[PDB]
Design an enzyme around this catalytic site. Structure first.
Site, PDB file in Angstrom:
ATOM      1  N   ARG A  27       3.389   1.660   6.657  1.00 17.67           N
ATOM      2  CA  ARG A  27       3.420   1.759   8.260  1.00 17.67           C
ATOM      3  C   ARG A  27       4.805   1.510   8.445  1.00 17.67           C
ATOM      4  NH1 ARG A  27      -0.420   4.915   7.806  1.00 17.67           N
ATOM      5  NH2 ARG A  27       0.470   5.104  10.203  1.00 17.67           N
ATOM      6  N   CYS A  70       0.756  -1.161   0.136  1.00 17.44           N
ATOM      7  CA  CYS A  70      -0.069  -0.085  -0.064  1.00 17.44           C
ATOM      8  C   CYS A  70       1.054   1.056  -0.026  1.00 17.44           C
ATOM      9  CB  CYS A  70      -0.834   0.083   1.193  1.00 17.44           C
ATOM     10  SG  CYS A  70      -2.219   1.246   1.157  1.00 17.44           S
ATOM     11  N   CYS A  85      -6.874   2.324   7.903  1.00 15.88           N
ATOM     12  CA  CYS A  85      -7.667   3.068   7.141  1.00 15.88           C
ATOM     13  C   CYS A  85      -7.053   3.818   5.881  1.00 15.88           C
ATOM     14  CB  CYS A  85      -8.771   3.973   7.677  1.00 15.88           C
ATOM     15  SG  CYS A  85     -10.017   3.434   8.812  1.00 15.88           S
ATOM     16  N   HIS A 114      -2.679  -4.201   4.890  1.00 19.56           N
ATOM     17  CA  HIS A 114      -3.035  -3.949   6.461  1.00 19.56           C
ATOM     18  C   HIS A 114      -4.327  -3.151   6.646  1.00 19.56           C
ATOM     19  CE1 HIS A 114      -2.369   0.199   6.381  1.00 19.56           C
ATOM     20  NE2 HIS A 114      -1.120   0.209   5.552  1.00 19.56           N
ATOM     21  N   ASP A 131       0.049   3.924   1.472  1.00 18.71           N
ATOM     22  CA  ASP A 131       0.002   4.225   2.906  1.00 18.71           C
ATOM     23  C   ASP A 131       0.852   3.425   3.831  1.00 18.71           C
ATOM     24  OD1 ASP A 131      -0.726   5.632   5.413  1.00 18.71           O
ATOM     25  OD2 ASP A 131      -2.438   4.151   5.570  1.00 18.71           O
TER      26      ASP A 131
END
Lengths: 216, 216
Positions: free
Chosen positions: B52, B48, B107, B104, B50
């Site tokens: 982490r 993604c 959101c 994951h 996004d």
């Protein structure tokens, strides 16, 4: 049909992950809630799939602070929905303050683009690099040294990727009404670990683009 | 022009890069020789945008060992030249032994795909997620809890991305003729930092795909 060595290799990754989690629990217990806390990124980083160092480490930030896209030769092709979705989401939904395109000289996609082979599926993608050369052919033909010419192509590829970001309606609209995001082009030197700002000049580039595409 | 805070923020990144290089010189004498090694990655990781945590940290590997692609909602759309180029290069040129898709629950793109809005340029990309729901509609409709249904959608999105990797000619040809690469689907849990193997049956999935597309 799946060789046993591939299954062992995969299982070792899960062992490494368990060890990595154990070590993070002893050394830095606060990291897990911090990781799961929920942070909006302030940076979009577009780099090469041949990653030498994670963007957030280079930039001394936490991974959650950098929205990331990596592709072959750190391209932003006009009609690529993949990268255009990353850009439109980062600007219109995440409201990132900076978009960075970052290249490096280590033999990857750009060198692959210079091999005169029919690579099937890959030809259309690598063609975008060859078109950077054609845009700057007068400059690059005049550079005698092979390494220097290659390095300048890598730089101009970052600069043209940055131009392609700046051309998006999302970046223009947002910068007009909010003064952000700004676009930066960088080179990461694997020999020294140092970032170099290629000094894109966001406002001048935006001005040139606006000559036929002035939204307001 | 451009606000002063953005300029200061950009300047801080360069200061962090200098500091980061100092600490790497102390902690790792040959880091920069290792960083420019030319070592061919054995893993392709599709995740993604996004992000982490960097893939190579989760997997306890060096960044040069993991070829990386990140996009919104970790998709592998049939027609996406960006991701198909990453896969064809990783298999045909890098000869990676593993391809991983990792999602994951934090959101991101998947939640954006469930918002019933006209997001213009984003609709075609996010539609791929909505089509994962429709493929697995009976299973997801049976999950009453919103969070559980969302989590299962995130898993099935990883599974369908993995199936799209296994469908590539490059993966089938290479696996037939050389027995690699193998494809794996993972979920990264932000609460614990542990990988979870979704146990995609590579042999069964390849067998199912081969029913109308058997290369050999």
């Amino acid at each position: 049909t799946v060789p046993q060595y591939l299954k062992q290799s995969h299982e070792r990754i899960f062992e490494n992950n368990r060890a990595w989690v154990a070590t993070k629990m002893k050394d830095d217990p606060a990291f897990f809630e911090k990781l799961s806390a929920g942070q909006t990124p302030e940076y979009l980083y577009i780099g090469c799939s041949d990653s030498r160092v994670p963007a957030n480490e280079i930039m001394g930030l936490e991974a959650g602070e950098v929205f990331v896209h990596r592709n072959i030769a750190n391209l932003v092709p006009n009609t690529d929905l993949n990268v255009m979705s990353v850009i439109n989401y980062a600007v219109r939904h995440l409201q990132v303050k900076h978009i960075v395109v970052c290249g490096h000289y280590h033999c990857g996609g750009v060198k692959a683009a210079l091999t005169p082979s029919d690579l099937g599926l890959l030809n259309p993608w690598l063609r975008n690099v060859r078109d950077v050369y054609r845009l700057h052919e007068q400059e690059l033909d005049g550079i005698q040294d092979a390494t220097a010419r290659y390095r300048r192509l890598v730089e101009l590829n970052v600069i043209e990727s940055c131009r392609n970001v700046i051309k998006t309606a999302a970046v223009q609209q947002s910068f007009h009404e909010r003064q952000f995001p700004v676009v930066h082009g960088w080179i990461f030197d694997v020999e020294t670990g140092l970032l170099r700002d290629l000094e894109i000049d966001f406002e001048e580039t935006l001005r040139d683009i606006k000559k036929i595409y002035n939204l307001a």
